Write an enzyme that holds these catalytic residues in place. Structure first.
Site, PDB file in Angstrom:
ATOM      1  N   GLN A 169      29.514 -35.094  -2.381  1.00 37.44           N
ATOM      2  CA  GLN A 169      29.290 -35.610  -1.039  1.00 37.44           C
ATOM      3  C   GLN A 169      29.451 -37.130  -0.979  1.00 37.44           C
ATOM      4  O   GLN A 169      29.461 -37.805  -2.004  1.00 37.44           O
ATOM      5  CB  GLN A 169      27.901 -35.200  -0.541  1.00 37.44           C
ATOM      6  N   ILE A 198      24.091 -32.723  15.258  1.00 35.46           N
ATOM      7  CA  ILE A 198      24.602 -33.078  16.573  1.00 35.46           C
ATOM      8  C   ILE A 198      25.294 -34.437  16.470  1.00 35.46           C
ATOM      9  O   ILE A 198      26.434 -34.605  16.912  1.00 35.46           O
ATOM     10  CB  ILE A 198      23.477 -33.171  17.607  1.00 35.46           C
ATOM     11  N   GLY A 199      24.598 -35.402  15.881  1.00 38.64           N
ATOM     12  CA  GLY A 199      25.176 -36.719  15.715  1.00 38.64           C
ATOM     13  C   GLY A 199      26.392 -36.649  14.812  1.00 38.64           C
ATOM     14  O   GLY A 199      27.395 -37.319  15.064  1.00 38.64           O
ATOM     15  N   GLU A 211      35.348 -20.967  16.782  1.00 39.49           N
ATOM     16  CA  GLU A 211      33.982 -21.385  16.511  1.00 39.49           C
ATOM     17  C   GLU A 211      33.797 -21.743  15.050  1.00 39.49           C
ATOM     18  O   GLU A 211      34.266 -21.029  14.155  1.00 39.49           O
ATOM     19  CB  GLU A 211      32.987 -20.279  16.883  1.00 39.49           C
ATOM     20  N   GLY A 231      34.068 -38.962   1.375  1.00 32.68           N
ATOM     21  CA  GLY A 231      35.039 -38.768   2.437  1.00 32.68           C
ATOM     22  C   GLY A 231      35.684 -37.396   2.530  1.00 32.68           C
ATOM     23  O   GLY A 231      36.507 -37.160   3.417  1.00 32.68           O
ATOM     24  N   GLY A 249      34.419 -34.375   3.392  1.00 33.21           N
ATOM     25  CA  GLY A 249      34.085 -33.677   4.622  1.00 33.21           C
ATOM     26  C   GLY A 249      34.852 -34.164   5.845  1.00 33.21           C
ATOM     27  O   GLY A 249      35.240 -33.373   6.712  1.00 33.21           O
TER      28      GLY A 249
HETATM   29  C1  LIG Z   1      28.269 -32.501   6.624  1.00 38.96           C
HETATM   30  C2  LIG Z   1      29.000 -32.624   5.243  1.00 38.96           C
HETATM   31  C3  LIG Z   1      30.109 -31.545   5.123  1.00 38.96           C
HETATM   32  C4  LIG Z   1      29.784 -33.965   5.122  1.00 38.96           C
HETATM   33  O1  LIG Z   1      30.651 -33.953   3.982  1.00 38.96           O
HETATM   34  P1  LIG Z   1      30.884 -35.311   3.094  1.00 38.96           P
HETATM   35  O2  LIG Z   1      31.858 -35.021   1.974  1.00 38.96           O
HETATM   36  O3  LIG Z   1      29.630 -35.854   2.496  1.00 38.96           O
HETATM   37  O4  LIG Z   1      31.435 -36.243   4.301  1.00 38.96           O
HETATM   38  P2  LIG Z   1      31.869 -37.693   4.406  1.00 38.96           P
HETATM   39  O5  LIG Z   1      31.826 -38.298   3.032  1.00 38.96           O
HETATM   40  O6  LIG Z   1      33.144 -37.827   5.199  1.00 38.96           O
HETATM   41  O7  LIG Z   1      30.580 -38.211   5.229  1.00 38.96           O
HETATM   42  C5  LIG Z   1      30.457 -39.604   5.606  1.00 38.96           C
HETATM   43  C6  LIG Z   1      29.110 -39.709   6.319  1.00 38.96           C
HETATM   44  O8  LIG Z   1      28.260 -38.497   5.994  1.00 38.96           O
HETATM   45  C7  LIG Z   1      26.979 -38.954   5.448  1.00 38.96           C
HETATM   46  N1  LIG Z   1      26.449 -37.957   4.447  1.00 38.96           N
HETATM   47  C8  LIG Z   1      27.178 -37.155   3.574  1.00 38.96           C
HETATM   48  N2  LIG Z   1      26.398 -36.367   2.789  1.00 38.96           N
HETATM   49  C9  LIG Z   1      25.131 -36.669   3.168  1.00 38.96           C
HETATM   50  C10 LIG Z   1      23.798 -36.169   2.707  1.00 38.96           C
HETATM   51  N3  LIG Z   1      23.665 -35.275   1.780  1.00 38.96           N
HETATM   52  N4  LIG Z   1      22.700 -36.729   3.347  1.00 38.96           N
HETATM   53  C11 LIG Z   1      22.852 -37.696   4.349  1.00 38.96           C
HETATM   54  N5  LIG Z   1      24.020 -38.194   4.815  1.00 38.96           N
HETATM   55  C12 LIG Z   1      25.099 -37.663   4.206  1.00 38.96           C
HETATM   56  C13 LIG Z   1      27.386 -40.266   4.803  1.00 38.96           C
HETATM   57  O9  LIG Z   1      26.220 -41.004   4.474  1.00 38.96           O
HETATM   58  C14 LIG Z   1      28.249 -40.911   5.904  1.00 38.96           C
HETATM   59  O10 LIG Z   1      27.512 -41.502   6.897  1.00 38.96           O
HETATM   60  P3  LIG Z   1      28.382 -42.699   7.675  1.00 38.96           P
HETATM   61  O11 LIG Z   1      29.740 -42.069   8.214  1.00 38.96           O
HETATM   62  O12 LIG Z   1      27.481 -43.374   8.810  1.00 38.96           O
HETATM   63  O13 LIG Z   1      28.664 -43.833   6.580  1.00 38.96           O
HETATM   64  C15 LIG Z   1      27.923 -32.625   4.059  1.00 38.96           C
HETATM   65  O14 LIG Z   1      26.919 -33.666   4.268  1.00 38.96           O
HETATM   66  C16 LIG Z   1      27.199 -31.295   3.887  1.00 38.96           C
HETATM   67  O15 LIG Z   1      27.769 -30.302   3.168  1.00 38.96           O
HETATM   68  N6  LIG Z   1      26.027 -31.197   4.485  1.00 38.96           N
HETATM   69  C17 LIG Z   1      25.159 -30.013   4.428  1.00 38.96           C
HETATM   70  C18 LIG Z   1      25.786 -28.896   5.239  1.00 38.96           C
HETATM   71  C19 LIG Z   1      25.594 -29.138   6.707  1.00 38.96           C
HETATM   72  O16 LIG Z   1      24.487 -29.565   7.208  1.00 38.96           O
HETATM   73  N7  LIG Z   1      26.669 -28.864   7.416  1.00 38.96           N
HETATM   74  C20 LIG Z   1      26.801 -28.997   8.931  1.00 38.96           C
HETATM   75  C21 LIG Z   1      26.069 -27.799   9.522  1.00 38.96           C
HETATM   76  S1  LIG Z   1      26.803 -26.154   9.085  1.00 38.96           S
END
Ligand SMILES: CC(C)(COP(=O)(O)OP(=O)(O)OC[C@H]1O[C@@H](n2cnc3c(N)ncnc32)[C@H](O)[C@@H]1OP(=O)(O)O)[C@@H](O)C(=O)NCCC(=O)NCCS
Lengths: 11, 162
Positions: free
Chosen positions: B85, B118-119, B74, B88, B90
């Protein structure tokens, strides 16, 4: 037990 | 830029890395009680894979819990520090995570998701429809009616990550 802290607002 | 499993062995170095990661999680997951993040992150059942920059600075990570006998894990928390952020990281972390789970003999990844998440997970290979028998996680993973339980099948010889 854990639950699923994978909990982000709406964004 | 390394993606290492961060062991909670009570040493100054790893404890500092886990705290840094826990702080990133809280800042990025405001709806989560900070003390709850602390509890799971440091408990005997969870593990964390971190994105280490320059072999010393944490810029993101994923906390998970393996249920070895059942062959599924999980995802507890996933996040990348704000200033790092949209670069790439994440996506590369998730691919590294899937690869590692494949090597750990894990067949399914499960995660609760809500709203945007979810998305986000759908793009990472997770689906709302489960192929894993419900009675497999029932009794192990809490069943909350308020969340969407999503799963990612980890095929034994599909190449995840790069
Ligand atoms: C989810 C998360 C880990 C992604 O990490 P990242 O390093 O930004 O990831 P990537 O760069 O590979 O992401 C690419 C996509 O994420 C979107 N994205 C990343 N950070 C974002 C932010 N702060 N707000 C909106 N979109 C975001 C990008 O716009 C992109 O969209 P696309 O694929 O249609 O072009 C990061 O946004 C995060 O820490 N979010 C808050 C924590 C969270 O909600 N985690 C999931 C639930 S526990």
């Amino acid at each position: 037990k854990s639950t699923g802290g994978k909990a982000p607002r709406k964004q | 830029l390394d993606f290492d499993i961060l062991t909670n062995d009570g040493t100054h170095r790893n404890m500092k890395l886990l705290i840094d990661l826990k702080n990133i999680f809280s800042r990025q997951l405001p709806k989560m009680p900070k003390e709850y993040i602390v509890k799971l992150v440091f408990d005997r059942h969870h593990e964390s894979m971190v994105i280490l920059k320059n072999k010393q600075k944490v810029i993101g990570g994923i906390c998970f819990r393996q249920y070895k006998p059942q062959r599924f894990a999980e995802v507890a928390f996933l996040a990348v520090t704000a200033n790092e952020q949209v670069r790439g990281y994440g996506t590369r972390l998730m691919n590294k995570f899937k690869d590692h789970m494949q090597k750990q003999n894990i067949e399914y990844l499960l995660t609760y998701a809500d709203n945007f998440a979810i998305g986000y997970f759908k793009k990472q290979g997770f689906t709302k429809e489960h192929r894993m028998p419900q009675e497999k996680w029932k009794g192990y993973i809490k069943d909350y009616d308020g969340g969407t339980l999503m799963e990612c099948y980890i095929h034994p010889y599909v190449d995840y990550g790069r």
